[PDB]
Ligand binder design. Structure first.
Ligand SMILES: CC(C)(C)NC[C@H](O)COc1cccc2c1CC(C#N)=N2
Ligand SMILES: CC(C)(C)NC[C@H](O)COc1cccc2c1CC(C#N)=N2
Ligand SMILES: CCCCCCCCS[C@@H]1O[C@H](CO)[C@@H](O)[C@H](O)[C@H]1O
Ligand SMILES: CCCCCCCCS[C@@H]1O[C@H](CO)[C@@H](O)[C@H](O)[C@H]1O
Ligand SMILES: CCCCCCCCS[C@@H]1O[C@H](CO)[C@@H](O)[C@H](O)[C@H]1O
Ligand SMILES: CCCCCCCCS[C@@H]1O[C@H](CO)[C@@H](O)[C@H](O)[C@H]1O
Ligand SMILES: CCCCCCCCS[C@@H]1O[C@H](CO)[C@@H](O)[C@H](O)[C@H]1O
Ligand SMILES: CCCCCCCCS[C@@H]1O[C@H](CO)[C@@H](O)[C@H](O)[C@H]1O
Ligand SMILES: CCCCCCCCCC
Ligand code: NA
Ligand code: NA
Lengths: 276, 274
């Protein structure tokens, strides 16, 4: 009945993630004072955290509690597709956020005229399409599959939902969905910092964004590191820690609304909807 | 430059096809030219073979007759292949840089991991990724714009203009060209710093460098005016687009020339030519 306490903490995180990110989306929707361009990209980020609290983690919980997949081969693949799309769309969006800031800070005039809200939406949409293209389709086209006896065994057990991939796909996709967008964000972000210094409230906002980014990297990097190591030497790091780290990635989805508590704005808008 | 340019243009199809067919055959004869690096060179020559046999010949009928003569589907397949090949090339050049850099700083781990079977896997992974970001948005019509101008071009089968929306135009460019480019350069610069700090291998590295420089010089213009049409669609004249685009095609004819720098290819080109 260890199953019962697990369904309690699990149910609890789903609550954090879902409540916190609905609060964000609603606060920004409420105040137009809170409606800036930056916050448009933040909403995009919130939505990807929502999908996780609503779809990814719920089914993911059953998998960890029962050590087996109850939902069938098709939903297994679908679930996996969704999981990957959400992490790709996050880091891709954090990228945009950084580059957006770096442009506003260096080219303030050429920035205001070119950058409206209709375009940020067009940009958000393009990140989700790019994210769908590089991480949803391939999984749904079955390119991730291995040829190994053990792999084929898994693909035929509706109870097995191990993301057992071929090594080509393991490298290509971690680089393409995570590493590249990560490097880019790290670089562009560093630059924004130097610029902000060569300029010394706006900074508190810039710092919050850096924190959002830094926590993202800490929460997900262990998993993508372990991912590559595995490609080289399959039995050098224990399956359970593989799972531990992926859950650290999932938990990130609840840290954002928490971090936004640094703001007076977000602090006075968080308490208007919770009724105080 | 006008007599010169004119001759080159009357010779490109021949120059690209015969020259790349020739690179392929040389690498496949002289087992002394059979090395990991040269397998990537071969992938690079197939990208070029395809440009020489499918892309350029049909593009020639278009620029000359002034109209698309083959139907709207062949038009969208054509644009597809054209996008594929640029994408596969610059990705393959990326892999060639990373491969060399790694063969030069971790040579043991390099000799132990990198094999021919492995390299082939890497080639196909690259071609796969390339069809993904080039064929697939075309088959889902993600490239299409809403403008009546664009719309009349979609009805005219005799019109094969690649009129795309701004979202697509920027994204497909960042993804097919600029990112792979930025990586290839940062990596090639690292490899230069290593080959330097380290002093016939440097002659083979200098050719790889020339291949990567000429590729950049040949395509960067076309992608620059491509970002410019995004800002203002009237700010740059069609003729300048055609020229820059053909500058890039002509790139498919340069490589075999450049390899004549090596004595092995030269030797082997001459054997092959009776
Ligand atoms: C239960 C599973 C394993 C589905 N969790 C997936 C993880 O949340 C997201 O992991 C990934 C995200 C993007 C790209 C990826 C990736 C894993 C691999 C691999 N090879 N490539
Ligand atoms: C005649 C046409 C116009 C068909 N030539 C296409 C060009 O050779 C290939 O250009 C491209 C290569 C890769 C990615 C690209 C791209 C053009 C765009 C755009 N937007 N995205
Ligand atoms: C982010 C998307 C990454 C996609 C990577 C796809 C990799 C396929 S590898 C390789 O392809 C060959 C066919 O071309 C098959 O014959 C081999 O059996 C297979 O192992
Ligand atoms: C996306 C990139 C985000 C970059 C964020 C930079 C935030 C800088 S806060 C600033 O830092 C100074 C030291 O540099 C301190 O002395 C100040 O007291 C403090 O207010
Ligand atoms: C590997 C194929 C690359 C094709 C590039 C051009 C795609 C044009 S859209 C494509 O046109 C077909 C014919 O109309 C339809 O049958 C398909 O459903 C549709 O998606
Ligand atoms: C690597 C290339 C990425 C391109 C990403 C997708 C396009 C974002 S804009 C949008 O996409 C539609 C639906 O597909 C078109 O029908 C519309 O007219 C167009 O305005
Ligand atoms: C990364 C893609 C950015 C696209 C900006 C598009 C503005 C389109 S206005 C119609
Ligand atoms: C990515 C593969 C190509 C990286 C760049 C390779 C070519 C330059 S190496 C460089 O060439 C010089 C002459 O120009 C020599 O004098 C130096 O000793 C040597 O170190
Ligand atoms: C604009 C955000 C950058 C995401 C690029 C995706 C990487 C694919 C290139 C190989
Ligand atoms: Na299964
Ligand atoms: Na047409």
């Amino acid at each position: 009945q260890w199953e019962a306490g697990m369904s309690l903490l699990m149910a609890l995180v789903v609550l954090l993630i879902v409540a916190g990110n609905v609060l964000v989306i609603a606060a920004i929707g409420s105040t137009q004072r809170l409606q800036t361009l930056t916050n448009l990209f933040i909403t995009s980020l919130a939505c990807a955290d929502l999908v996780v609290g609503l779809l990814v983690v719920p089914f993911g919980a059953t998998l960890v509690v029962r050590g087996t997949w109850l939902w069938g081969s098709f939903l297994c693949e679908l679930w996996t597709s969704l999981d990957v799309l959400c992490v790709t769309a996050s880091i891709e969006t954090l990228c945009v956020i950084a580059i957006d800031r770096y442009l506003a800070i260096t080219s303030p005039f050429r920035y205001q005229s070119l950058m409206t809200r209709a375009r940020a939406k067009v940009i958000i949409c393009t990140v989700w399409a790019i994210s769908a293209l590089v991480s949803f389709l391939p999984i749904m086209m079955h390119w991730w599959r291995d040829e190994d006896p053990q792999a084929l065994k898994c693909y035929q057990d509706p109870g097995c939902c191990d993301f057992v991939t071929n090594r080509a796909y393991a490298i290509a996709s971690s680089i393409i969905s995570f590493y590249i967008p990560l490097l880019i964000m790290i670089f562009v972000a560093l630059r924004v910092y130097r610029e902000a210094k060569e300029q010394i409230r706006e900074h508190k906002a810039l710092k919050t964004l850096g924190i959002i980014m830094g926590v993202f990297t800490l929460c997900w990097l262990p998993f993508f590191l372990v991912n590559i190591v595995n490609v080289f030497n399959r039995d050098l790091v224990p399956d359970w820690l593989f799972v531990a780290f992926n859950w650290l990635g999932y938990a990130n989805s609840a840290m954002n609304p928490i971090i936004y508590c640094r703001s007076p704005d977000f602090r006075k808008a968080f308490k208007r909807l919770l009724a105080f």
